[PDB]
Amino acid sequence: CEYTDWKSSGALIPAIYMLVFLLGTTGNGLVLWTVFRSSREKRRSADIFIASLAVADLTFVVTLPLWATYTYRDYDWPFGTFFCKLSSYLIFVNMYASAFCLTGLSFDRYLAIVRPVANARLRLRVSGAVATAVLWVLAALLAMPVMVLRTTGDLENTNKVQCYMDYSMVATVSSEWAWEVGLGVSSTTVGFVVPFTIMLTCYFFIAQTIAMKKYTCTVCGYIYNPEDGDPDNGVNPGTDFKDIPDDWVCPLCGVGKDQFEEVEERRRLLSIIVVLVVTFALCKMPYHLVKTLYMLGSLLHWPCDFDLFLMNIFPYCTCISYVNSCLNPFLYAFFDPRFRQACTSMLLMGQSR
């Protein structure tokens, strides 16, 4: 049906992009400061993925003022073909690297909390060092079709030089939509669907082990572990503390079930990673859903009024998805105690001198 050229929504979206740049440069730079200053054997298993996540966000945040200009100029790129190629490449590099850093953080919690294989093969620091190298190789290779296909051209008969994906090089005469639906679906799959499913499965197994809560005796100090149980007292290994018959007492001091305290493990790392995934899911979900509904709209012959709704909601969907870059340093300020303590350490000593 009828389709007009993409126009500017207002001054709201370009102003947010400038704010995300300002908060993202200083914010992610403060994250990279705290991790690299604390070297030696003091580094956490999660720190390697946090530092790379800060690198991915920082490099993309610098390209946002160029995109803020593009939005307000009603989608017209005045920075040339080279900057269009580099700016668009760093969007998808960030998209893949940030999603792979989150899976890395989630899998690091899986290997630590669940422990499927013995500590000999486990090698948490080695596995983290290998996966961080692979994710940077994967993100750079998966974002390469964006580096090649992007050019500054006059899309349709509209007098505007815009930064777009040119399929005239790879696609034939009719298979123009095939390459957009091909590279578009795979981008959402390897950049959001597959990563988010790994994060959720990792959390399901982590929750499965945490569910078996240990109980400590307040009288002597005996810790009942559901994994070990008490086979001598007629309690099979695997049985939960609540499932234990009421006649059972402490095998070391002989006190009833009422004198046992439930232990709530101080899992700080899990809390930091959970909030990072939750925010990422809330920021990236609308962008990927609207784009998929746009693909599955022209193919399934969806009503014309629905395509108009997706087009007007999309600039706001990309906006909040880009806010995610400057969102993490604020999340570490409210949930990560080690980041909080390291920032305050350079506050009293650094400024004084």
């Binding site: 007009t4 100029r73 989608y75 005045p78 349709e156 578009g184 962008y287």
Partner: peptide, 17 residues
């Protein structure tokens, strides 16, 4: 330089992001 333009009809364009 930069200049604001009136809407023009066209084909289904792929999302600009």
């Amino acid at each position: 330089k930069f200049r604001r333009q009136r809407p023009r009809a066209e084909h289904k364009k792929x999302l600009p992001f």
